Design a protein that fits this description.
This is part of a larger assembly, with chains A and B.
Chain A: H1 3-7, E1 14-17, E2 23-28, E3 33-40, H2 54-62, H3 71-80, E4 84-89, E5 94-101, H4 105-116, H5 123-142, H6 144-157, H7 170-174, H8 178-188, E6 194-200, H9 204-214, E7 230-233, E8 241-248, H10 256-266, E9 274-281, E10 286-294, H11 299-315, H12 319-336, H13 340-353, H14 360-369, H15 372-382, E11 389-393, H16 402-407
Parallel strand pairs in A: 2-6, 7-11
Antiparallel strand pairs in A: 1-2, 3-5, 3-6, 4-5, 8-10, 8-11, 9-10
Chain B: E1 13-16, H1 28-68, H2 74-77
The chains are: A alpha+beta, B mainly alpha.
Chain lengths: 414, 79
């Protein structure tokens, strides 16, 4: 039972295409419980400035009422079965998933359909959601990391729909009318842009039957540029500095993603406080970089260490470090896929992203392909001598100026 | 005296662009030349008059020195 041998034991995810275009995917397993869900290829990047907060508002009011049963009735039905409904919205995906028992599958799928097709947008509920989101703005204001990453996206993509926040501006959510939400639903929540994904104790034909019964009535019928800018909010009274630096990364459909993951896994928090590396991926672009918290007096040293690690990977990457990174990536993948909710989310996102559920054997073969020479070449392709996007939430004063940061992206020795 | 601790500024946000993204000579004729012209207009009426007075004094002094050494008709006419 070697690792490569063990990967074959993973059951495949059967995929079927309905008449209206909805893609139904399942990963059956000997699990007492399952997590069904609907994933939609609609996010903030598909919204104009007129309706920037439309998707987040729809997520807020999705469980607050549908035509068949009022919001209280929907919530009571969820709670009585013991299930947990959840939803999330990214700049490119939107998911509603019901986590329940294997024998509760027939109801849950129906629930999803009731949420997806016929959503009751009560005006009073809409105003209540307005108030809730207005409070949630101040709630999110506390989170420094989220503000930093929003700054990073805004400065990196600027004049692109990929740069606006998922929540949207306060004015936009304030003036977002019901008709705008209905138009957003009509133009976006439609098959074949939907994947009904389930895993665990679910039989694929059962899921297909439920989808045809409930999710069968769904209607059948700008250049993204990376600008290496920076944003610098100071607020010197904050305890620790937050910084996120990134460069444009490849989209979802690119072989270089695995090498970049290995490079990130290869990337000393002693100088820092909590330093992390991220490889956010989108359809055609992506943010590959790092994010760390700093003392007021140690931003420069941490930035120097991070950029030195980047340069070392780009120029001279030994085989031992690359092997360690590959092992770390394999362990991270397999450990992340543990759990019913993770595999369901992976199925949905993969279908919305690759058009297919890439098996673990392919992932491991691709990782085995990765070599120190490949790591160096791809890192030089994407990291070496590239204009970065920097976002700093203060206290930032020791953060090097953009010319210094840019000059730190190449080595005079090399 | 290092950059870490110099002063306390609060919620001042600045946006910057990469030197390679932008152009080295923006608004050369739309803004640059009018800006230089307005700067020159502002400083002209405060700088020039002193040097104009200097030039007047220079010319008058040179001419008077020339006149001083070309004279005395009557000094020999009485002879």
């Amino acid at each position: 039972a070697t690792f490569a041998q063990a990967l074959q034991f993973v059951p495949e995810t059967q995929v079927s295409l309905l008449d209206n275009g909805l893609r139904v995917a399942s990963e059956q397993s000997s699990q007492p419980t399952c997590t069904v869900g609907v994933w939609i290829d609609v996010g903030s990047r598909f919204e104009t400035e007129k309706n920037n907060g439309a998707g987040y508002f729809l997520e807020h009011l999705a469980f607050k009422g549908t035509k068949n049963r009022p919001g209280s009735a929907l919530e009571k039905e969820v709670e009585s079965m013991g299930a947990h409904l959840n939803a999330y919205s990214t700049r490119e995906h939107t998911a509603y998933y019901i986590k329940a028992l294997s024998k509760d599958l027939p109801k849950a799928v129906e629930l999803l359909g009731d949420i997806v097709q016929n959503c009751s947008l009560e005006d009073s509920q809409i105003e209540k959601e307005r108030d809730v989101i207005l409070r949630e703005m101040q709630e999110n204001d506390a989170s420094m990391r989220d503000v930093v990453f929003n700054y990073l996206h805004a400065t990196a993509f600027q004049g692109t729909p990929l740069a606006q926040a998922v929540e949207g501006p306060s004015e936009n959510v304030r003036k977002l009318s019901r008709a705008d939400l209905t138009e957003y639903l009509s133009t976006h929540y439609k098959a074949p842009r939907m994947v009904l994904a389930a895993a665990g104790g679910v039989e694929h034909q059962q899921l297909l039957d439920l989808a045809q019964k409930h999710l069968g009535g769904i209607p059948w019928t700008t250049p993204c540029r990376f600008t290496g800018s920076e944003i610098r909010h100071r607020d010197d009274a904050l305890p620790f500095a937050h910084v996120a630096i990134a460069v444009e990364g490849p989209g979802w459909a690119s072989p270089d993603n695995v090498a970049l993951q290995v490079a990130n896994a290869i990337i000393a928090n002693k100088l820092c406080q909590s330093f992390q590396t991220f490889s956010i991926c989108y359809a055609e672009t992506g943010l590959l970089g790092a994010h760390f918290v700093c003392d007021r007096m140690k931003i420069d040293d941490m930035m120097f260490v991070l950029q030195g690690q980047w340069m070392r990977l780009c120029t001279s990457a030994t085989e031992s470090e690359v092997a360690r990174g590959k092992n770390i990536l394999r362990n991270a993948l397999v450990s992340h896929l543990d759990g019913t909710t993770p595999v369901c989310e992976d199925i949905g996102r993969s279908l919305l992203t690759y058009g297919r559920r890439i098996p673990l054997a392919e992932w491991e073969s691709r990782i085995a392909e990765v070599d120190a020479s490949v790591v160096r070449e791809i890192c030089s392709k994407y990291i070496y001598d590239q204009c970065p996007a920097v976002a700093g939430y203060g206290p930032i004063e020791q953060l090097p100026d953009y010319n210094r940061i840019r000059s730190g992206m190449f080595w005079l020795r090399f | 005296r290092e950059f870490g601790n110099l002063t306390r500024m609060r919620h001042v946000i600045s946006y910057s662009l990469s030197p390679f993204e932008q152009r080295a000579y923006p608004h050369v004729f739309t803004k640059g030349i009018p800006n230089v012209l307005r700067r020159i207009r502002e400083s002209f009426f405060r700088v020039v008059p002193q040097f104009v007075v200097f030039y007047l004094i220079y010319t008058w002094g040179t001419e008077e020195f020339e006149r001083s050494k070309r004279k005395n008709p009557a000094a020999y006419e009485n002879d």
